[PDB]
Write a structure and sequence with these properties.
The structure is cut from a larger assembly and holds chains A (51 residues), B (88 residues), C (100 residues), D (117 residues), E (55 residues) and F (271 residues). With 88 residues, chain B is mostly helical. In chain B, 75% of the residues lie in helices and 0% in strands. The chains are: A mainly alpha (51), B mainly alpha (88), C alpha+beta (100), D alpha/beta (117), E mainly alpha (55), F mainly beta (271). Chain F binds 2 RNA strands through strand 9, strand 11, helix 1 and strand 14. Chain F: Pfam families: Ribosomal_L2_C, Ribosomal_L2_N.
RNA sequence: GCUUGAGUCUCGUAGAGGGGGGUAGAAUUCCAGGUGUAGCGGUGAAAUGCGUAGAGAUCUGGAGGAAUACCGGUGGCGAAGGCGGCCCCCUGGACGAAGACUGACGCUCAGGUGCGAAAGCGUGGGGAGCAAACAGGAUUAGAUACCCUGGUAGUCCACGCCGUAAACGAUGUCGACUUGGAGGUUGUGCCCUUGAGGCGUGGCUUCCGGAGCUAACGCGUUAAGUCGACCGCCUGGGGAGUA
RNA sequence: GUUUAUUAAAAACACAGCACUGUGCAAACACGAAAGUGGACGUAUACGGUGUGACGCCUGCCCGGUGCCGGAAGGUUAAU
């Protein structure tokens, strides 16, 4: 949302613009409510990746 | 559940010796006490199949122990039936 | 007979009647053979969200061992008292370092 | 001009269209502009430039009131969020707060199953 | 044993938005994560801890 | 929960027996009883005004405490009794002062347990409280349209009005049809919902079941000649005009509400 | 007779196990108001739709019904189906330490009985989202579809019925034996209470893997290995789980 | 079961059951020039009206017309 910062800024930016979890949870809340197999698919992929 | 003090009274009343919590009379008496409590539990709303499975398990294990008591010694079996009011 | 932890928040405008509140509730509890372990009046406290369009509420915690019947009628009194805006009755929450 | 001179810009950046509404702190709307009304329709509506034109249009819409500082309330997953914010500080209003007010439910109502293909 | 009254301790495990932190991040054991989750949900009920940042 | 009814006869085929063992078997309370002489399609003028009302079993009326006074005295519930006048059952209540009354029967009945309405009350349906004092999200019944009037809404079997909060002076009520009506917060309320929902499950089964209930036959207008009803005539089954009442107004659609004093209170109307 | 199988007792431990009742918070929709004014919604692009009768946006007050974001994890629990907010009441099971007790009371089980997702059925409620059927709009040669705007039964609750699923680990239940490694979860003993640090010992679980087995893929101490008890089932494919 | 007493007892009317619509209580609706009364000493699991007529399978399409429901952009609109 927003974290406490000093009112004068060197330049007007947001620190966590592209890292916000809001966009991802909005994309998952919109449609496609499977939620059963992707946990196992993610776990098998993660176990393959970790060596 | 069966209370500790009720369980101790059952083992002291139906036990041929003290600390005989394992005798067949004591096991059948404890099982009957839980049957009589669970009947009042299952009077209300009667949809608890999961607890009813444990209830039917107490019934079945009681039947096996009473059949064992029949084959081993019939005098004790008839006395236990007369004490707990079953198989009328 | 049974250990319980009771926390209730009171509307800020009704803050004058909370010592009488805890006195009558403790009296009912002690009449029902209960023992009060830690009667702590937390006092007024800002709330993280508004409930019933109020922002600051009185708080008091009781931590009583008592029978289930007196705790259920206590819960009824909490539901029917309009000063209590929310009340929670927990499980044993046994004897630990008091005043937490 | 207006005496309070403080406002909030609500950026409803949906996937198709971005609506920018500058209101006061009490919620009463002073002005609004949209990506469809900015002159871009169809595929260009979703693009970040359309939201920039929407922000500039609402900026000149509330230039009558003399808004000096505006907090920013951002809703939605659309491409127009950061573009609308940038176009507001380009329009020269001081941005005092940037809050992400997207309605994130709890497990909530059932989502639409549509667009499955 | 994690008490909901210790909102000072639970603030270390809530995020800025009010969410319960992941155990893979804070390194709590599974048992203390579950007790922490129950305590946060109780304190959220008592309004000691906020449900979300906005409200 | 339902005892089976064999089809020994047509007329016994369709009705299946749904009864309550908790209902009292015996005479009703005589102080709370008065006569109810049937007035079947009658008037002071003597004419039929409401049709299909007629011959049935004699019913004696029971005084039911729609307005719940005697507050401050705990009421112990007794065995529930059958009320032929209303759809739901009635419950005997004995207060600590000795006053015996009839109320609408709550869902829960406790035998051998004292019932209290003050400080020592439990979480039990049937407790009376004003609309200001109801809990958040609570369902109430026997609520009053005017403060001090008596019960007007949710007095039937299985009917309840749910309320979450209040505006401050007028509280909105979600009725069973779906209408939303603001009544004053001083109006009384009885917590929970009324029983005897299971009683409505069974079908009547025969013509004589309705004729016991007091319902005389309904003749369709198409059966009649042109003069008895606007529908009616011809050598075939259908008259073939727009659906109307015997006096001419449209049956289908055609909203007939004309009250304008109460339109401010009824902010929302059901479809 | 015996205690080594199976069981009982004491003390604890973890858990979306079940049933009942209460409450909280987001969010969606609707109703009434405040500001406000030409678009909104949607899509591959469009259109139906909604909107100058003032929508969409934003604020406030209220109503209602569902699922409980984060925690959340090839985590836990349950015989399976399955079970996720918090709280209370009622209850089933597992597991661990130290002993005590009973003394084969055990295993399986055709018939039989019970539980059995979702959809469906009956009666009565409820109905916010979603949505079979249905309507309109688009794509196409056509499109009784995929896409869009709607939308009823249903999904929700009480009681009763069905008795089916790719109900799967496509792997029946019980007991014994047979190299290891990395983990997750829950007990417990000791040292160094002294780094939720070292050393053990149980229960469930995930992955890889040796011998062995298999037609191969793979399984592999939770076997598809080596055995024993008992039950169910199969005997080419369509016809056919049909008459 | 009821029905044209006195040429028609039926396949007619009714009937349980089913749907739709109205109706938030001083309720709709009805008899009343009105007071009043019935509905109802009932409260949407209730009432009234319409059609169908136990039970099993179910109830297709078409809102162009008429009717009803909702909105009054715009026009045309009475007394005043």
């Amino acid at each position: 949302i927003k974290v406490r910062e000093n009112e004068p800024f060197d330049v007007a930016l947001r620190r966590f613009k592209r890292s916000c979890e809001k966009a991802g949870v909005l994309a998952e809340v919109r449609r496609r409510e499977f939620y059963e197999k992707p946990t196992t698919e993610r776990k098998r992929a993660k176990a393959s990746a970790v060596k | 559940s069966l209370s500790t003090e009720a369980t101790a009274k059952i083992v002291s009343e139906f036990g041929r010796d003290a600390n005989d919590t394992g005798s067949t009379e004591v096991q059948v008496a404890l099982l009957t006490a839980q049957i009589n409590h669970l009947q009042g539990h299952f009077a209300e709303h009667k949809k608890d199949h999961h607890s009813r499975r444990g209830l039917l398990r107490m019934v079945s294990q009681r039947r096996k122990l009473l059949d064992y008591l029949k084959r081993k010694d019939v005098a004790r079996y008839t006395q236990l039936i007369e004490r707990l009011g079953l198989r009328r | 007979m049974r250990h319980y932890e009771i926390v209730f928040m009171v509307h800020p405008d009704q803050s004058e009647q909370v010592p009488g509140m805890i006195e009558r509730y403790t009296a009912a509890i002690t009449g029902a053979e209960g023992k009060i372990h830690r009667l702590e009046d937390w006092g007024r406290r800002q709330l993280a969200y508004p409930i019933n369009k109020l922002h600051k509420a009185h708080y008091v915690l009781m931590n009583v061992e008592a029978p289930q019947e007196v705790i259920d009628e206590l819960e009824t009194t909490f539901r029917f008292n309009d000063a209590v805006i929310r009340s929670m009755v927990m499980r044993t929450k046994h004897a630990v370092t008091e005043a937490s | 001009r207006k005496q309070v001179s403080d406002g909030v810009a609500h950026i409803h950046a949906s996937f198709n269209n971005t609506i920018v509404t500058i209101t006061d702190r009490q919620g009463n709307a002073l002005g609004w502009a949209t990506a469809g009304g900015s002159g871009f329709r169809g595929s260009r509506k979703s693009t970040p430039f359309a939201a920039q034109v929407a922000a500039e249009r609402c900026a000149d819409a509330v230039k009558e009131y003399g808004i000096k500082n505006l907090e920013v309330m951002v809703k939605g997953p659309g491409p127009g969020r950061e573009s609308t914010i940038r176009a507001l500080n380009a329009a020269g209003f001081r941005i005092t707060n940037i809050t992400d007010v997207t309605p994130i439910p709890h497990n909530g109502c059932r989502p639409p199953k549509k667009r499955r293909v | 044993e994690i008490d909901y009254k210790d909102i000072a301790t639970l603030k270390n495990y809530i995020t800025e938005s009010g969410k319960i932190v992941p155990s893979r991040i804070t390194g709590t054991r599974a048992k203390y994560q579950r007790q922490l989750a129950r305590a946060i949900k109780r304190a959220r009920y008592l309004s000691l801890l906020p449900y979300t940042d906005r409200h | 929960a339902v005892v089976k009814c064999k089809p020994t006869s047509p007329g016994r085929r369709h009705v299946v027996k749904v009864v309550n063992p908790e209902l009292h078997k015996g005479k009703p309370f005589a102080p709370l009883l008065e006569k109810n002489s049937k007035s079947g399609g009658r008037n002071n003028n003597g004419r039929i005004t409401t049709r299909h009302i007629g011959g049935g079993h004699k019913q004696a009326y029971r005084i039911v405490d729609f307005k719940r006074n005697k507050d401050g005295i705990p009421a112990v519930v007794e065995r529930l009794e059958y009320d032929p006048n209303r759809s739901a059952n009635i419950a005997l209540v004995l207060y600590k002062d000795g006053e015996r009354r009839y109320i609408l029967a709550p869902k829960g009945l406790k035998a051998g347990d004292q019932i209290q309405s003050g400080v020592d009350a439990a979480i039990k349906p049937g407790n009376t409280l004003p609309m200001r004092n109801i809990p958040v999200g609570s369902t109430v019944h026997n609520v009053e349209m005017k403060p001090g009037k008596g019960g007007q809404l949710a007095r039937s079997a299985g009917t309840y009005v749910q309320i979450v909060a209040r505006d401050g002076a007028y509280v909105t009520l979600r009725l069973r049809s779906g209408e939303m009506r603001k009544v004053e917060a001083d109006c009384r309320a009885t917590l929970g919902e009324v029983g005897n929902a299971e009683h409505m499950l069974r079908v009547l089964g025969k013509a004589g079941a309705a004729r016991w209930r007091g319902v005389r036959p309904t003749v369709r207008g198409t059966a009649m000649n042109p003069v008895d009803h606007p529908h009616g005539g011809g050598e075939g089954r259908n008259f073939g005009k727009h659906p109307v009442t015997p006096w001419g107004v449209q049956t289908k659609g055609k909203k007939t509400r004309s009250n304008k004093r109460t339109d401010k209170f009824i902010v929302r109307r059901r479809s």
